[PDB]
């Protein structure tokens, strides 16, 4: 009621940001062949 | 040396004891809310009014329920289709009247276990494996967003979603054949063969495997003893295992190669339940299965009954009692 | 001898080039001369209904069944 | 009393299989508690 | 000696006249209810 | 030597189709229960028994044809060829129903004979007999529900016909006569065939994605001879894998495919049990405490109460078209409709 | 109204079968402590 | 008085897998 | 006797011949496929 | 007010400053390591194993 | 190895142990048995049936004398 | 020999499909 | 009228300690045919 | 984890002690149970 | 009913006096 819901899109884009800046940190590079 | 790669390292570490991994970031947090949301409502709920004709449905235990019958009811036919969270309620007790933690734990379900889903490719991708885990997965995911998401989308409400319960789930699949035929429809056909099938050769293939032991115990300890963990040499004749099928019914039906017969254990279910889930999407927008009704007429053009004739006076006593209340008009178009 | 081996064969196919054929046709005939109906005795679409009995027939009786079956077969 | 039997072996559950009996008896009894209470 | 491709060629396409004869009944003769 | 050796070793000789000691009972019975199922849905019809259409002869397609339960009145009759009902005439055999209890009796000894099958081959090859304990579970089911269950009943007509659709209204015929689906037997059946089924997608899935190099094709299939001694694909990665994703896992593959055989046969033997207790009308239909609260609280609704309603509406509407014999003649006044439906 | 004996059906059904499974576990790792010899074999 | 039952059959139940995840007999080779 | 009973043991009889027409010719064709040592 | 056309379902002023502090708060970690990098520096590879 | 006075008069019929009938035997005796009494399995299952009918023979409840 | 094996179940087959393709004609 | 919560407490009065002193003998005796090393330790 | 630790003990229960410890549950079983069921 | 439970508590009393004297662990010298 207005102020649970500033808390709900706190804690979504927290979240997602780690999702969307999780990839964008050269992602495909973390594999056990090399590096 | 930065503060985000020092954390980048920890969250795709293989080290933890748990994989959690970018997808982990969406997963932890949504199914954990799915999880607490769901013992609080399956526990300690007030009733829903789910026909939208404010005649509360009690699901949870408090109100007199016990494994089988309590569950976490749809939200309402008020509602509908419309997004319902909790600060567009004004206040918890209009939320829980009107249906709220159905919507509350199923899209933080399906955000949940679309990002389960992912996370069995991440692993598999710093594991080294080869990456296809995932697509096995697919075939529940398909299923569960088939019941949850996408007839209540083409049906308009999420008040035809199905309960979360195990007396819900038999409300959902008996309403669903008075007005839909299921059975007749080819996709839920092709997917009980997926899981007849699926158990078929799941105990035809682990039994081939446990006739064919190799002698590493004696007759006191576990036949299990005889496997050590991580080594090499193979624990089954599977040339023992090759001969018996190969008699069993004949020569030429029988897998020699491991990796093909090992490929088709993964096909079968999978391609099973994939067009299953989308026998229920089809149905959710009203292409129904077949309809042989009045089909068999003589040359005088009176209908001769049929097993289908039979089938459909079933459905008709479901159909004219589902939500008995509800109606006021004479076809169900919802 | 392997499977494969026989229906590429030539001498296969000169003898089943006949047996198929003279096979088939008699699965035809089996039906349209209206021999089916009477060995299995079920019935042709003249004769569900007749102008006698207008109901569904059903056997009533445990012993005379057969004897109830020519009732229901004459008309 | 007579000598010592030379039958005699030893029981042995391991950890694994302590879990499946655990959770095979409490989901049988979560199963079939709904209908004996009536 | 036939090609082996030959024979599932003819053979294949006589079950999709057999098939194809099948689902025409559905809509006509007996079972169609015309 | 003896004319029992001669036998014998002839039966056991290495052929196209093995047959042995047991295919004098498979191949005769196993060949006139699937003919007499062919026969039954091609020609014979259901007009007299239950008053139906159940032949290719009568406009049904493969779905909506059977080869269908006899009447009620021929009771629990084995319908023999030459017995007080048919006497000898094929003709009134097949229209009282005869061939469905020539394909069930015939098709029951060739899951005797199919059984026995698997002892006979596993002796001879030299393996543990495992195949033939999980084949048991399919015959606990064609036993449990093709003879014990109308052998409870009134007569044979309430057993499943032998056809696609005609085992759909015996799925819909057991849920608002009985409530199947509330019956914990039923309940442990689904665990296991749908615990089956995933078991089988799993290790499908795993074997073939945790697979050694061995080619340089990018072909997997063809990197692998059968008689070769290393191990296909790497357990300890298996492991690896999915104790960190799903938190336990399997560390041993004699433990591995024999839980794979466990699951779906159980699934089948303890589903078997519940259907021989409704062959005796030993249901589980109500909760009394859910029942006596809905008759003095006029308001209070489960999602169970609303499944009664429902098998009302299968114990009316169908009962009249269902049962031709007992002659129901209902009114249009007492059948439960809804409002406006 | 229940069923006042279901308590005792279900709570001896599972405590009776549980605490039996417990049993030959605590033997069990006791004859693997007792054949080691160190510290716990007594 | 009757969900009491139910309740701790649950949150029983949810104990031993608990206890089955993280308590796990860990597999050595050799 | 009756109808019934003089039926039943003529199948009896007709089981008979249906078991034996397989025997007999299993055991003539069984001396002929006999197996070189 | 449920139904109204708004975007992202910023109903009042402050969820803006929400949505905004939450994107650039993980975007600022992300700069510290892959920002102020090379912007010229290719690769003819199909995936690139450059730096940290 | 105890020896009690029970265990005395027992012993001759546990003294043997695997002594057989050298060659076929007395099995052609046996399966003629078996045949029989598979007939005799089929015939009352047929009589109780109501499969198989014999004269003054009715299947129902009867008067038991009382 | 095995010519008895295979057209015990195709000498049928064949048959019965020349029944089921004239009841496609079949009508009232 | 009897109190029906007096059957729980006595039939888990009487078998949920009872069945305690059981294990403290069973393992007591598996380390003792742990150490002893024939035929039963495993 | 950390390494093992050095005050592990084991547990004893003799025979004698288990027939104390079985007829202490049942007498105090017989003499409290009249006044629970009241 | 409720004197089936003060029936097994007693002979159930009494099955332990049993195992106790003829069941007992010997006690020897050496
Ligand atoms: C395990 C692996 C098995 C391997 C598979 C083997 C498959 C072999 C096939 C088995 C053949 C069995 C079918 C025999 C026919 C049948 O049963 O026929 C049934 C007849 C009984 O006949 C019925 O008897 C009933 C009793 O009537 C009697 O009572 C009535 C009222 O009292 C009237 O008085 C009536 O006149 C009087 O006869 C009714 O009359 C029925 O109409 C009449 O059909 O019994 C009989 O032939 C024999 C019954 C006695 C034998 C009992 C064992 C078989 C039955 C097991 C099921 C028991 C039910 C438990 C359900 C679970
Ligand atoms: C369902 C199938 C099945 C299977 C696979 C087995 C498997 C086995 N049985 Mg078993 N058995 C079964 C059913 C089965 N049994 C039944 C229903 C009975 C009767 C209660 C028996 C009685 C039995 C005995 C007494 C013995 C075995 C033995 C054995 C073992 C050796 C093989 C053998 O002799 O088979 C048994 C042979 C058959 C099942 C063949 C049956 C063919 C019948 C006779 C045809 C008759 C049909 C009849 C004329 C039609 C009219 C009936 C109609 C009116 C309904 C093996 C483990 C032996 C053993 O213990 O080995 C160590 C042994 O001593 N069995
Ligand atoms: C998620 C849905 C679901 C699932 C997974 C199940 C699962 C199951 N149900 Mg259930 N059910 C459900 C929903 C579900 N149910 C609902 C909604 C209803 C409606 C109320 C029912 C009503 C229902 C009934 C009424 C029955 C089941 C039964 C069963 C069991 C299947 C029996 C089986 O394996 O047959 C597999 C078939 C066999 C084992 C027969 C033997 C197969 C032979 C060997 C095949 C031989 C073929 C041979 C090769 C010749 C072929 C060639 C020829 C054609 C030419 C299984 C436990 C049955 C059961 O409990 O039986 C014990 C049963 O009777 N269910
Ligand atoms: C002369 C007179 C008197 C005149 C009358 C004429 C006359 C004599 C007539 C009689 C003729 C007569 C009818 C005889 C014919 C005999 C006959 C065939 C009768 C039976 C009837 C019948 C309906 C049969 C058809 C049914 C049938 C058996 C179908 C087989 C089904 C089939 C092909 C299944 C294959 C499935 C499959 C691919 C399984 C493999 C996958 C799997 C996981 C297996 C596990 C596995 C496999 C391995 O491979 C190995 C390695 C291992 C490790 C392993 O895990
Ligand atoms: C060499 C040896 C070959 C071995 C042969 C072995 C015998 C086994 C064959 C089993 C076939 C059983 C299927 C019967 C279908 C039938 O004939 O329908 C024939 C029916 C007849 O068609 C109906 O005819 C009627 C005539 O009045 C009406 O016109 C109906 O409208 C029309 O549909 O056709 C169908 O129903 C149409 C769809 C057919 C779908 C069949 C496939 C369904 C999936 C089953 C797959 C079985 C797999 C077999 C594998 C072998
Ligand atoms: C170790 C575990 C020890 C616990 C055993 C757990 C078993 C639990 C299941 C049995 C208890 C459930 C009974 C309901 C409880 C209840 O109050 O009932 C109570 C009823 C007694 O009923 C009471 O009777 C009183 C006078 O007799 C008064 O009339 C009461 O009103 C009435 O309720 O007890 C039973 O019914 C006990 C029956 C147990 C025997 C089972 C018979 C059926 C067995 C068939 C076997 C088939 C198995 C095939 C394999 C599968
Ligand atoms: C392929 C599968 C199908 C894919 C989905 C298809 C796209 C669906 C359309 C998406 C709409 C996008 C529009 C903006 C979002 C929207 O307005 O939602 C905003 C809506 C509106 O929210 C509601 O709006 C109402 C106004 O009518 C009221 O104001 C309510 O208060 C307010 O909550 O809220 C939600 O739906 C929230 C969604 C939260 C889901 C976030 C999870 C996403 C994480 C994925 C990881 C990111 C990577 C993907 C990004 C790249
Ligand atoms: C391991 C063993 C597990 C079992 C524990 C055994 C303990 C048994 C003794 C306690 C149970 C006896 C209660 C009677 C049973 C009954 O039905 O009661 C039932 C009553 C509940 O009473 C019920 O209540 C319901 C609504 O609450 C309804 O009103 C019912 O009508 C009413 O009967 O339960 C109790 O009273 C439980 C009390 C237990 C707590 C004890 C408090 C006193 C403790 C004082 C501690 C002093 C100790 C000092 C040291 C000595
Ligand atoms: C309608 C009939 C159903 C589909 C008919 C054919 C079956 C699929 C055969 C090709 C499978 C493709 C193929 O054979 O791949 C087999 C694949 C391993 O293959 P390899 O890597 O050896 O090679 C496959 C490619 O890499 C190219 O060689 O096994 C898997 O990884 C199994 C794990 C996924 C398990 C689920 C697989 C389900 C996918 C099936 C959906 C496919 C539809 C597209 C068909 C091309
Ligand atoms: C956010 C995601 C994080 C993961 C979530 C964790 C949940 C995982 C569930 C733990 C399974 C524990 C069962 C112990 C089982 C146990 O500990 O087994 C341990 C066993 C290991 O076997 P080994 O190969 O060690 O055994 C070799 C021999 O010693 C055999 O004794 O692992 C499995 O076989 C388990 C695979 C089937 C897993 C069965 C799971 C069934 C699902 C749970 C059903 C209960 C749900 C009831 C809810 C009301
Ligand atoms: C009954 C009887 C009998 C007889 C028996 C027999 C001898 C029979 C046989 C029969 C048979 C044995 C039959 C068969 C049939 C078959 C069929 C008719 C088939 C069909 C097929 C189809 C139609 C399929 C299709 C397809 C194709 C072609 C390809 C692709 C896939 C599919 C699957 C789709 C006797 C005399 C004893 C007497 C008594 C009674
Ligand atoms: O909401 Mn649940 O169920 Ca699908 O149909 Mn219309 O809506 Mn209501 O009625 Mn019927
Ligand atoms: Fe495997």
Same mark, same amino acid.
């Given at each position: 009621?207005?102020?649970?819901?500033?808390?709900?899109?706190?804690?979504?884009?927290?979240?997602?940001?780690?999702?969307?800046?999780?990839?964008?940190?050269?992602?495909?590079?973390?594999?056990?062949?090399?590096? | 040396?930065?503060?985000?790669?020092?954390?980048?390292?920890?969250?795709? =570490?293989?080290?933890?004891?748990?994989?959690?991994?970018?997808?982990?970031?969406?997963?932890?947090?949504?199914?954990?809310?799915?999880? =607490?949301?769901?013992?609080?409502?399956?526990?300690?709920?007030?009733?829903?009014?789910?026909?939208?004709?404010?005649?509360?449905?009690?699901?949870?235990?408090?109100?007199?329920?016990?494994?089988?019958?309590?569950?976490?009811?749809?939200?309402?036919?008020?509602?509908?289709?419309?997004?319902?969270?909790?600060?567009?309620?004004?206040?918890?007790?209009?939320?829980?009247?009107?249906?709220?933690?159905?919507?509350?734990?199923?899209?933080?379900?399906?955000?949940?276990?679309?990002?389960?889903?992912?996370?069995?490719?991440?692993?598999?991708?710093?594991?080294?494996?080869?990456?296809?885990?995932?697509?096995?997965?697919?075939?529940?995911?398909?299923?569960? =967003?088939?019941? #949850?998401?996408?007839?209540?989308?083409?049906?308009?409400?999420?008040?035809?979603?199905?309960?979360?319960?195990?007396?819900?789930? #038999?409300?959902?699949?008996?309403?669903?054949?008075?007005?839909?035929?299921?059975?007749?429809?080819? #996709?839920?056909?092709?997917?009980?063969?997926?899981?007849?099938?699926?158990?078929? #050769?799941?105990?035809?293939?682990?039994?081939?495997?446990?006739?064919?032991?190799?002698?590493?115990?004696?007759?006191?300890?576990?036949?299990?003893?005889?496997?050590?963990?991580?080594?090499?040499?193979?624990?089954?004749?599977?040339?023992?295992?090759?001969?018996?099928?190969?008699?069993?019914?004949?020569?030429?039906?029988?897998?020699?190669?491991?990796?093909?017969?090992?490929?088709?254990?993964?096909?079968?279910?999978?391609?099973?339940?994939?067009?299953?889930?989308?026998?229920?999407?089809?149905?959710?927008?009203?292409?129904?299965?077949?309809?042989?009704?009045?089909?068999?007429?003589?040359?005088?053009?009176?209908?001769?009954?049929?097993?289908?004739?039979?089938?459909?006076?079933?459905?008709?006593?479901?159909?004219?009692?589902?939500?008995?209340?509800?109606?006021?008009?004479?076809?169900?178009?919802? | 001898?392997?499977?494969?081996?026989?229906?590429?064969?030539?001498?296969?196919?000169?003898?089943?080039?006949?047996?198929?054929?003279?096979?088939?046709?008699?699965?035809?005939?089996?039906?349209?001369?209206?021999?089916?109906?009477?060995?299995?005795?079920?019935?042709?679409?003249?004769?569900?209904?007749?102008?006698?009995?207008?109901?569904?027939?059903?056997?009533?009786?445990?012993?005379?069944?057969?004897?109830?079956?020519?009732?229901?077969?004459?008309? | 009393?007579?000598?010592?039997?030379?039958?005699?072996?030893?029981?042995?559950?391991?950890?694994?299989?302590?879990?499946?009996?655990?959770?095979?008896?409490?989901?049988?009894?979560?199963?079939?508690?709904?209908?004996?209470?009536? | 000696?036939?090609?082996?491709?030959?024979?599932?060629?003819?053979?294949?396409?006589?079950?999709?006249?057999?098939?194809?004869?099948?689902?025409?009944?559905?809509?006509?003769?007996?079972?169609?209810?015309? | 030597?003896?004319?029992?050796?001669? /036998?014998?070793?002839?039966?056991?000789?290495?052929?196209?189709?093995?047959?042995? $000691?047991?295919?004098?009972?498979?191949?005769?019975?196993?060949?006139?229960?699937?003919?007499?199922?062919?026969?039954?849905?091609?020609?014979?019809?259901? $007009?007299?028994?239950?008053?139906?259409?159940?032949?290719?002869?009568?406009?049904?397609?493969?779905?909506?044809?059977?080869?269908?339960?006899?009447?009620?009145?021929?009771?629990?009759?084995?319908?023999?060829?030459?017995?007080?009902?048919?006497?000898?005439?094929?003709?009134?055999?097949?229209?009282?129903?005869?061939?469905?209890?020539? +394909?069930?009796?015939?098709?029951?000894?060739?899951?005797?004979?199919?059984?026995?099958?698997?002892?006979?081959?596993?002796?001879?090859?030299?393996?543990?007999?495992?195949?033939?304990?999980?084949?048991?579970?399919?015959?606990?089911?064609? /036993?449990?529900?093709?003879?014990?269950?109308?052998?409870?009943?009134?007569?044979?007509?309430?057993?499943?016909?032998?056809?696609?659709?005609?085992?759909?209204?015996?799925?819909?015929?057991?849920?608002?006569?009985?409530?199947?689906?509330?019956?914990?037997?039923?309940?442990?059946?689904?665990?296991?065939?749908?615990?089956?089924?995933?078991?089988?997608?799993?290790?499908?899935?795993? +074997?073939?994605?945790?697979?050694?190099?061995?080619?340089?094709?990018?072909?997997?299939?063809?990197?692998?001879?059968?008689?070769?001694?290393?191990?296909?694909?790497?357990?300890?990665?298996?492991?690896?894998?999915?104790?960190?994703?799903?938190? /336990?896992?399997?560390?041993?593959?004699?433990?591995?495919?024999?839980?794979?055989?466990?699951?779906? +046969?159980?699934?089948?033997?303890?589903?078997?049990?519940?259907?021989?207790?409704?062959?005796?009308?030993?249901?589980?239909?109500?909760?009394?405490?859910?029942?006596?609260?809905?008759?003095?609280?006029?308001?209070?609704?489960?999602?169970?109460?609303?499944?009664?309603?429902?098998?009302?509406?299968?114990?009316?509407?169908?009962?009249?078209?269902?049962?031709?014999?007992?002659?129901?003649?209902?009114?249009?006044?007492?059948?439960?409709?809804?409002?406006?439906? | 109204?229940?069923?006042?004996?279901?308590?005792?059906?279900?709570?001896?059904?599972?405590?009776?079968?549980?605490?039996?499974?417990?049993?030959?576990?605590?033997?069990?790792?006791?004859?693997?402590?007792?054949?080691?010899?160190?510290?716990?074999?007594? | 008085?009757?969900?009491?039952?139910?309740?701790?059959?649950?949150?029983?139940?949810?104990?031993?897998?608990?206890?089955?995840?993280?308590?796990?007999?860990?597999?050595?080779?050799? | 006797?009756?109808?019934?009973?003089?039926?039943?043991?003529?199948?009896?009889?007709?089981?008979?011949?249906?078991?034996?027409?397989?025997?007999?010719?299993?055991?003539?064709?069984?001396?002929?496929?006999?197996?070189?040592? | 007010?449920?139904?109204?056309?708004?975007?992202?379902?910023?109903?009042?002023?402050?969820?803006?400053?929400?949505?905004?502090?939450?994107?650039?708060?993980?975007?600022?970690?992300?700069?510290?390591?892959?920002?102020?990098?090379?912007?010229?520096?290719?690769?003819?590879?199909?995936?690139?194993?450059?730096?940290? | 190895?105890?020896?009690?006075?029970?265990?005395?008069?027992?012993?001759?019929?546990?003294?043997? %142990?695997?002594?057989?009938?050298?060659?076929?035997?007395?099995?052609?005796?046996?399966?003629?048995?078996?045949?029989?009494?598979?007939?005799?399995?089929?015939?009352?299952?047929?009589? %109780?049936?109501?499969?198989?009918?014999?004269?003054?023979?009715?299947?129902?409840?009867?008067?038991?004398?009382? | 020999?095995?010519?008895?094996?295979?057209?015990?179940?195709?000498?049928?087959?064949?048959?019965?499909?020349?029944?089921?393709?004239?009841?496609?004609?079949?009508?009232?």
């Amino acid at each position: 009621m207005l102020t649970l819901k500033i808390l709900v899109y706190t804690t979504v884009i927290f979240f997602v940001s780690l999702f969307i800046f999780g990839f964008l940190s050269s992602d495909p590079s973390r594999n056990p062949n090399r590096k | 040396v930065s503060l985000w790669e020092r954390f980048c390292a920890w969250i795709t =570490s293989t080290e933890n004891r748990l994989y959690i991994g970018w997808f982990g970031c969406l997963m932890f947090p949504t199914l954990l809310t799915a999880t =607490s949301c769901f013992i609080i409502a399956f526990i300690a709920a007030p009733p829903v009014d789910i026909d939208g004709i404010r005649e509360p449905v009690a699901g949870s235990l408090l109100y007199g329920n016990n494994i089988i019958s309590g569950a976490v009811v749809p939200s309402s036919n008020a509602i509908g289709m419309h997004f319902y969270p909790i600060w567009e309620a004004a206040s918890i007790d209009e939320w829980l009247y009107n249906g709220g933690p159905y919507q509350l734990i199923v899209l933080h379900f399906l955000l949940g276990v679309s990002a389960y889903m992912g996370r069995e490719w991440e692993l598999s991708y710093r594991l080294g494996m080869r990456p296809w885990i995932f697509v096995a997965f697919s075939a529940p995911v398909a299923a569960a =967003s088939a019941v #949850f998401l996408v007839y209540p989308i083409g049906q308009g409400s999420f008040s035809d979603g199905m309960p979360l319960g195990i007396s819900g789930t #038999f409300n959902f699949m008996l309403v669903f054949q008075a007005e839909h035929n299921i059975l007749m429809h080819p #996709f839920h056909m092709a997917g009980v063969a997926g899981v007849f099938g699926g158990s078929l #050769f799941s105990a035809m293939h682990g039994s081939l495997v446990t006739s064919s032991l190799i002698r590493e115990t004696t007759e006191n300890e576990s036949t299990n003893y005889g496997y050590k963990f991580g080594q090499e040499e193979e624990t089954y004749n599977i040339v023992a295992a090759h001969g018996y099928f190969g008699r069993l019914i004949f020569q030429y039906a029988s897998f020699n190669n491991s990796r093909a017969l090992h490929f088709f254990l993964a096909l079968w279910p999978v391609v099973g339940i994939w067009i299953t889930s989308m026998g229920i999407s089809t149905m959710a927008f009203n292409l129904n299965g077949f309809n042989f009704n009045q089909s068999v007429v003589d040359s005088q053009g009176r209908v001769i009954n049929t097993w289908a004739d039979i089938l459909n006076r079933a459905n008709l006593g479901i159909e004219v009692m589902h939500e008995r209340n509800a109606h006021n008009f004479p076809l169900d178009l919802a | 001898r392997p499977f494969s081996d026989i229906i590429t064969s030539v001498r296969y196919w000169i003898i089943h080039s006949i047996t198929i054929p003279s096979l088939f046709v008699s699965g035809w005939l089996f039906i349209s001369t209206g021999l089916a109906y009477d060995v299995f005795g079920t019935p042709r679409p003249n004769e569900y209904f007749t102008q006698d009995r207008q109901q569904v027939p059903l056997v009533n009786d445990r012993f005379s069944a057969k004897q109830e079956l020519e009732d229901l077969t004459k008309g | 009393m007579t000598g010592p039997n030379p039958n005699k072996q030893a029981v042995e559950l391991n950890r694994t299989s302590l879990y499946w009996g655990l959770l095979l008896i409490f989901v049988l009894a979560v199963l079939f508690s709904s209908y004996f209470f009536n | 000696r036939i090609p082996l491709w030959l024979v599932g060629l003819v053979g294949g396409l006589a079950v999709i006249t057999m098939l194809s004869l099948f689902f025409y009944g559905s809509y006509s003769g007996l079972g169609s209810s015309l | 030597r003896g004319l029992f050796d001669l /036998v014998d070793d002839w039966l056991k000789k290495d052929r196209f189709v093995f047959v042995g $000691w047991s295919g004098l009972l498979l191949f005769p019975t196993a060949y006139l229960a699937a003919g007499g199922w062919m026969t039954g849905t091609t020609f014979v019809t259901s $007009w007299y028994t239950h008053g139906l259409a159940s032949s290719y002869l009568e406009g049904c397609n493969f779905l909506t044809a059977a080869v269908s339960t006899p009447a009620n009145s021929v009771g629990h009759s084995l319908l023999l060829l030459w017995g007080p009902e048919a006497q000898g005439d094929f003709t009134r055999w097949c229209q009282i129903g005869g061939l469905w209890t020539f +394909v069930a009796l015939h098709g029951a000894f060739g899951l005797i004979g199919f059984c026995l099958r698997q002892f006979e081959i596993a002796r001879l090859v030299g393996i543990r007999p495992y195949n033939a304990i999980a084949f048991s579970g399919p015959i606990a089911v064609f /036993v449990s529900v093709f003879l014990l269950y109308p052998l409870g009943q009134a007569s044979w007509f309430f057993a499943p016909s032998f056809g696609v659709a005609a085992i759909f209204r015996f799925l819909l015929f057991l849920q608002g006569f009985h409530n199947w689906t509330l019956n914990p037997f039923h309940m442990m059946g689904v665990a296991g065939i749908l615990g089956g089924a995933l078991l089988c997608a799993i290790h499908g899935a795993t +074997v073939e994605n945790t697979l050694f190099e061995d080619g340089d094709a990018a072909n997997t299939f063809r990197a692998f001879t059968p008689t070769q001694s290393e191990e296909t694909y790497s357990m300890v990665t298996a492991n690896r894998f999915w104790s960190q994703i799903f938190g /336990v896992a399997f560390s041993n593959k004699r433990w591995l495919h024999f839980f794979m055989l466990f699951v779906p +046969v159980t699934g089948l033997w303890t589903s078997s049990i519940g259907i021989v207790g409704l062959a005796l009308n030993l249901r589980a239909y109500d909760f009394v405490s859910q029942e006596l609260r809905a008759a003095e609280d006029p308001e209070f609704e489960t999602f169970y109460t609303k499944n009664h309603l429902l098998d009302e509406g299968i114990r009316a509407w169908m009962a009249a078209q269902d049962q031709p014999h007992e002659n129901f003649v209902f009114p249009e006044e007492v059948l439960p409709r809804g409002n406006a439906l | 109204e229940v069923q006042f004996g279901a308590y005792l059906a279900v709570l001896l059904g599972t405590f009776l079968p549980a605490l039996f499974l417990v049993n030959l576990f605590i033997q069990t790792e006791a004859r693997k402590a007792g054949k080691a010899g160190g510290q716990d074999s007594d | 008085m009757e969900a009491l039952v139910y309740t701790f059959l649950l949150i029983g139940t949810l104990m031993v897998i608990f206890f089955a995840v993280f308590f796990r007999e860990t597999p050595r080779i050799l | 006797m009756t109808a019934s009973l003089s039926n039943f043991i003529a199948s009896l009889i007709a089981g008979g011949v249906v078991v034996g027409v397989i025997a007999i010719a299993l055991i003539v064709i069984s001396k002929s496929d006999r197996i070189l040592r | 007010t449920e139904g109204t056309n708004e975007w992202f379902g910023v109903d009042d002023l402050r969820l803006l400053a929400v949505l905004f502090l939450g994107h650039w708060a993980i975007l600022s970690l992300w700069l510290g390591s892959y920002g102020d990098s090379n912007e010229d520096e290719d690769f003819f590879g199909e995936i690139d194993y450059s730096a940290r | 190895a105890l020896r009690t006075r029970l265990g005395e008069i027992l012993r001759p019929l546990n003294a043997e %142990y695997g002594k057989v009938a050298p060659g076929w035997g007395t099995t052609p005796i046996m399966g003629i048995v078996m045949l029989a009494f598979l007939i005799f399995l089929v015939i009352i299952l047929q009589i %109780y049936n109501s499969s198989l009918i014999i004269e003054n023979v009715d299947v129902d409840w009867a008067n038991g004398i009382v | 020999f095995r010519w008895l094996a295979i057209h015990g179940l195709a000498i049928p087959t064949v048959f019965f499909l020349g029944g089921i393709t004239a009841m496609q004609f079949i009508q009232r």
